[PDB]
Amino acid sequence: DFDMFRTKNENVDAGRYFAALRGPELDEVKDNEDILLPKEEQWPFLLRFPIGCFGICLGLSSQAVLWLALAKSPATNFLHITPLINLVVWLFSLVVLVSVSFTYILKCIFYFEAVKREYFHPVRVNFFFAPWVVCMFLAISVPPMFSPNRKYLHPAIWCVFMGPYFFLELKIYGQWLSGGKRRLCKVANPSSHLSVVGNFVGAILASKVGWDEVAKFLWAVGFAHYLVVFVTLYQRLPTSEALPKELHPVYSMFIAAPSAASIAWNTIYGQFDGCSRTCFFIALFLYISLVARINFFTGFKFSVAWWSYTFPMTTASVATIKYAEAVPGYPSRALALTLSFISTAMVCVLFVSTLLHAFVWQTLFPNDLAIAITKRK
Amino acid sequence: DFDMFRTKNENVDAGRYFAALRGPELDEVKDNEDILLPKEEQWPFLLRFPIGCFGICLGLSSQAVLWLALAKSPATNFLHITPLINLVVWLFSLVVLVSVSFTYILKCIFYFEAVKREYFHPVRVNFFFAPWVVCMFLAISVPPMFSPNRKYLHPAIWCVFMGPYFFLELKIYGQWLSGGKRRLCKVANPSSHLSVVGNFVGAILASKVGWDEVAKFLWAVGFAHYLVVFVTLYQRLPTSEALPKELHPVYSMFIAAPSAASIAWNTIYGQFDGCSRTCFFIALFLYISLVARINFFTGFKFSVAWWSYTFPMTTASVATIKYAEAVPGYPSRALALTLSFISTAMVCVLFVSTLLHAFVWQTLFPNDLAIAITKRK
Amino acid sequence: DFDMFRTKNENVDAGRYFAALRGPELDEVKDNEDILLPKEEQWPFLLRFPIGCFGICLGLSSQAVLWLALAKSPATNFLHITPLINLVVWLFSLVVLVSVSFTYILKCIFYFEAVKREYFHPVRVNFFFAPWVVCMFLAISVPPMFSPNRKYLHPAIWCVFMGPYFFLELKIYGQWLSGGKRRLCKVANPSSHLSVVGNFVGAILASKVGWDEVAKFLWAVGFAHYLVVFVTLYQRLPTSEALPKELHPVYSMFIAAPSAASIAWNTIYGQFDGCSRTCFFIALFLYISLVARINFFTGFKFSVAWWSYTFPMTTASVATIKYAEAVPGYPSRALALTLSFISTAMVCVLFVSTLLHAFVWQTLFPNDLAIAITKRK
Ligand SMILES: CC(C)CCC[C@@H](C)[C@H]1CC[C@H]2[C@@H]3CC=C4C[C@@H](OC(=O)CCC(=O)O)CC[C@]4(C)[C@H]3CC[C@]12C
Ligand SMILES: CC(C)CCC[C@@H](C)[C@H]1CC[C@H]2[C@@H]3CC=C4C[C@@H](OC(=O)CCC(=O)O)CC[C@]4(C)[C@H]3CC[C@]12C
Ligand SMILES: CC(C)CCC[C@@H](C)[C@H]1CC[C@H]2[C@@H]3CC=C4C[C@@H](OC(=O)CCC(=O)O)CC[C@]4(C)[C@H]3CC[C@]12C
Ligand SMILES: [Cl-]
Ligand SMILES: [Cl-]
Ligand SMILES: [Cl-]
């Protein structure tokens, strides 16, 4: 009954995924579709654990970077924040990463057919890049107590975390520019921004190890693929529910890239110039359009994907503290504090609601029917 | 007979507009379409006054900026032009703006159903931005006689004219990036450039009031939406007559944005550097392609839209006088004079022909049948 | 039998070319198509000489620039290369250009109907720009022995070679932005990059004659048309074989433009800054993706188009020697030598195989059936 997904269902085209699945994330089966697995009896645990549980790590590792700059930035020195907030968040986020990583490796050893189904899913494919972006955020945020009294980190740290990321993006980018079944015009969705943001995060790590020329190379590659993905989202593409007819929290993924580019540019050249200010000012316009409404707060439903919509907001807050240093004053101090407060509050709500579902309602790991769709209809 | 358009016809999709209307501006009914109003008997005056009469103001307020720089620029000081040309043009343009604004407000108070029809017209929608761009050109061009002996203008002038413009563009830009019925790929036309040029014109006004950081923010937003609209016009879009098969005066709208960006960049940083020279040199290439032909002059027919094709040519002339200051010489003096002469001559022809039609042929306000199309066919 | 192609078959739409032709270059007739000429009897010689024999000149004139920098660059002065390699290659390439040019002029005087068929071919149209790019490479590479002891060249050389190129691109670019039958979305192919690279090559020549402002203007125009052609190749276009489903040597045409822009920028401003490093670093990423595989070498078949895939690789090597001067060291010396060796080896293989086919197998000038397709089907 469950032996088809066990380790030893051919690769289904992305068109079938868009035709049989509905929703902003393609995680629900339509009403005329038949699945290959039972719909009522509980499934094995390792078959209902999605690849999207790595988004919790992205939401906690990005909050450690923010609180290290708050307690050390010259623009925030009027308040006195203890350095122990970064220590606690940095240790807590590391524990969660190890638990999520160890559980997914077990699934690959026992259920490898289900892992291949998620790889070919047009939306879930971008979450195979997130395991390495969480490790780069944790390395540019190490608590001073644990850091050696040296100016630079060992270059071997950059090679171990940016190696697999570069290998994966070499294959994916080649497919985009070709005329195959998996070209950008056939798969491009709002979540396709996770395969670009990792170029700018790795540029910061390269500078911190003493390799400035390598950082410049990674900035140029991330810049060429963000404009292709940014202009491609305004054209006519496959019809589906991956593009909500109204403004919906999924559009926050368009802010991560510009904010990280501004932060990465200021670290390579030492100053917040006309390039970082343009990157920072593009991401700030998008922040207002998505957050300056009243339905953004009134309409809020819990989901595991919510953990992936908060990390692009905590990154825009890190770039606002760098901008306040280049332009000292009261207009900039208030802007930095306002964005930081909103991001932290959004993460506190998700923390409480996640525990209530797990140990008070027991509805956090339902069956994953989106991976049992038929290949032919 | 006329009570359906009176103040108290549902919102028709942009597809219906493209299917029932023909021409470079979508102002004529096809030969198989039926209208909802009489086609022979004269209509009420307020029902045949379009929103495109604000283009006359754009053609006269942009000519006052040119003649203030001609009499004050160091590169033009060999000729001796009286400062009284700017005074006369500046006062004349203000009178026309007040008369056009007061007449359209009356239509909204008595015929509000016809105003909503123009708002949803894919081409006429961009002319709701023009009432504020005419007021910003008049504020950066005030005749010295009326100006106070101070270095900066009061910041309240910027807030009163750029406030409504920012509010309107927040709503429109949000629709472009969503998956609704009014996304750019469904409505994008050559006239869609009027909703972007106002970001660069407001950046100049911000600098003149002492707010340089605000000007930089408005430059970044205008730059992100011009590349989306510039690359989107080369793709496959709804089939209609909004894109002439040959070069036609409507393509002059592609020059306004690059010329204003170069002028706005030189005011924020004080020098004509490698950014202003690239913006200026892109707009100059387009000027030659559209004006260096012989059919541009042989084929000329009077229209009220002609008043909206001249303002992008008078702006390219203002950027040519700024460039002549950074590069003094005879090659630059001749270039500035040549472009200025052509723009002024084009506006003199429209001035005489407009009066002849009004008081010698009485054919300037025909019935507007493009707003009476049926919603269902 | 051959009188229809003789000098005195209407202009066939680009759609017919894509529907009746197959292959990465549109040079083979499909299996259900009928031709207008005999398929077995040998044709006249002047009717089987394509416009793509000018690609041999591009492969030999670009190799003279490389070997002049190797013997004169400060970064390569540890090795001692004789200046006589540039002299021999420069003289040999000039002889080939004169022979190819004289043969094609004869065809136009006797077979003008076949020349018009190649002009309207969506792929062969871009090879009408190559006759002038070969003359600009030969003028920025003149052997010192033949050069006058002056700092600058005569400006008349720039006018005679860049005049015809500018005239041709004025007409083509106008068609792209219009709504006609030959707009970019209807014809855009990988070979469309040859009509843009000539703007950057002419900028270098302008600087060498003392006209720096003219060079800046040509850089801005080439930059605006490369982003349109670069983003347009990721959209949904006419279905055909012009876009191979896998990585194929034809994709090397995407490297020529970025490499020449970096070289041209360093000559206008004197230094390899953050603009040349971004252009250079984008072209280097594409080089790895196309050359760092094992099927690039195992799968190699001789073709006359191979001569047009090597010139974009010899240009990326010229930009690597300029970068090694701005960043002296051993990491940069090895990179420059590695790319130069590969480009030279690829050209030596094509040289031997071209002579074997001509005088050992007699299969170098087959009948050109792609120009005899019917216009109606
Ligand atoms: C990467 C994503 C987030 C997009 C945001 C930035 C980009 C759109 C790039 C492309 C063009 C760049 C601008 C183009 C040219 C310049 C001039 C550049 O060099 C100068 O000439 C110095 C000017 C000065 O500061 O005086 C200063 C930065 C700036 C404005 C650039 C800022 C960054 C821009 C907007
Ligand atoms: C806004 C519309 C009208 C488009 C026209 C301008 C843009 C296409 C931007 C994006 C990239 C920019 C260029 C990219 C990088 C630079 C380097 C920039 O910074 C430097 O490195 C200084 C170089 C120098 O002047 O020495 C100088 C301006 C320039 C050429 C920029 C000019 C403005 C460009 C062409
Ligand atoms: C032409 C093709 C091959 C594309 C490759 C280059 C372009 C994508 C342009 C557009 C935006 C440009 C960049 C945008 C802004 C700048 C800042 C510009 O001006 C500065 O502010 C100086 C910064 C410094 O060097 O300190 C320096 C070059 C650079 C990075 C530009 C490099 C060239 C870019 C990437
Ligand atoms: Cl950081
Ligand atoms: Cl001004
Ligand atoms: Cl050279």
Side-chain angles (χ1 to χ4, degrees), chain B residues 230 235 243-245 277 323, chain C residues 177 179 183 213 217 228 235:
Chain B
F230 176 87
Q235 306 317 310
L243 223 54
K245 269 177 235 323
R277 267 176 222 228
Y323 172 78
Chain C
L177 67 79
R183 46 164 30 217
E213 303 286 339
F217 169 83
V228 165
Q235 306 317 310

Side-chain angles (χ1 to χ4, degrees), chain B residues 80-221:
Chain B
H80 304 95
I81 281 149
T82 192
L84 302 213
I85 297 130
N86 167 75
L87 183 96
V88 179
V89 185
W90 187 100
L91 284 170
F92 183 68
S93 147
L94 168 80
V95 157
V96 168
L97 169 77
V98 181
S99 309
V100 158
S101 268
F102 171 86
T103 325
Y104 208 85
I105 304 177
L106 284 178
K107 170 197 213 173
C108 307
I109 299 163
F110 291 113
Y111 295 103
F112 193 63
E113 291 303 307
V115 169
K116 300 202 286 176
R117 286 270 199 145
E118 304 194 88
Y119 188 74
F120 285 129
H121 185 301
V123 171
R124 295 182 190 205
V125 64
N126 315 278
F127 280 84
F128 282 89
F129 277 90
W132 325 103
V133 177
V134 168
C135 280
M136 291 207 268
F137 271 150
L138 275 181
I140 64 170
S141 57
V142 186
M145 218 197 298
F146 308 151
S147 272
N149 297 49
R150 320 207 220 80
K151 173 57 190 316
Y152 287 141
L153 298 159
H154 193 281
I157 293 153
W158 182 87
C159 298
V160 159
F161 297 147
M162 188 90 221
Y165 191 109
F166 197 80
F167 165 89
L168 203 39
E169 100 193 347
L170 254 183
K171 167 161 208 65
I172 298 267
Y173 289 173
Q175 289 166 6
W176 285 0
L177 67 79
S178 303
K181 293 310 225 59
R182 298 210 141 64
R183 46 164 30 217
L184 199 56
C185 72
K186 312 222 73 43
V187 294
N189 47 99
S191 304
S192 286
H193 265 305
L194 251 170
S195 52
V196 172
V197 80
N199 276 292
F200 292 121
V201 172
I204 302 158
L205 185 63
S207 290
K208 294 210 195 229
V209 312
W211 291 356
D212 262 343
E213 303 286 339
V214 180
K216 278 176 226 198
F217 169 83
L218 285 182
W219 198 98
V221 181

Side-chain angles (χ1 to χ4, degrees), chain A residues 219 223 265 269 271 273-275, chain C residues 200 219 223 226 257-258 261 274-275 278-279 282:
Chain A
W219 198 98
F223 180 87
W265 192 267
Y269 288 103
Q271 55 261 331
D273 61 9
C275 177
Chain C
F200 292 121
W219 198 98
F223 180 87
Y226 174 82
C275 177
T278 309
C279 293
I282 289 162

Side-chain angles (χ1 to χ4, degrees), chain A residues 136 140 152 158 162 166 169 196-224 260-270, chain C residues 274 277-278 280-282 284-285 323 327:
Chain A
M136 291 207 268
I140 64 170
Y152 287 141
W158 182 87
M162 188 90 221
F166 197 80
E169 100 193 347
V196 172
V197 80
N199 276 292
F200 292 121
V201 172
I204 302 158
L205 185 63
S207 290
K208 294 210 195 229
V209 312
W211 291 356
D212 262 343
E213 303 286 339
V214 180
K216 278 176 226 198
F217 169 83
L218 285 182
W219 198 98
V221 181
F223 180 87
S262 84
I263 303 160
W265 192 267
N266 180 44
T267 310
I268 291 154
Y269 288 103
Chain C
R277 267 176 222 228
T278 309
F280 167 74
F281 278 142
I282 289 162
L284 172 77
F285 182 81
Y323 172 78
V327 185

Side-chain angles (χ1 to χ4, degrees), chain A residues 324-363:
Chain A
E325 293 164 355
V327 185
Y330 286 15
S332 64
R333 268 157 185 46
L335 183 76
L337 300 175
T338 302
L339 257 77
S340 311
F341 181 82
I342 299 175
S343 317
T344 321
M346 226 50 236
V347 161
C348 293
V349 184
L350 278 177
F351 192 88
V352 180
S353 67
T354 306
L355 299 169
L356 283 188
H357 280 85
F359 307 115
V360 164
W361 298 328
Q362 303 250 356
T363 40

Side-chain angles (χ1 to χ4, degrees), chain A residues 69-81 321 325 333 337:
Chain A
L70 279 174
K72 287 200 348 197
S73 175
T76 63
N77 213 272
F78 55 98
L79 341 112
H80 304 95
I81 281 149
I321 298 176
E325 293 164 355
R333 268 157 185 46
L337 300 175

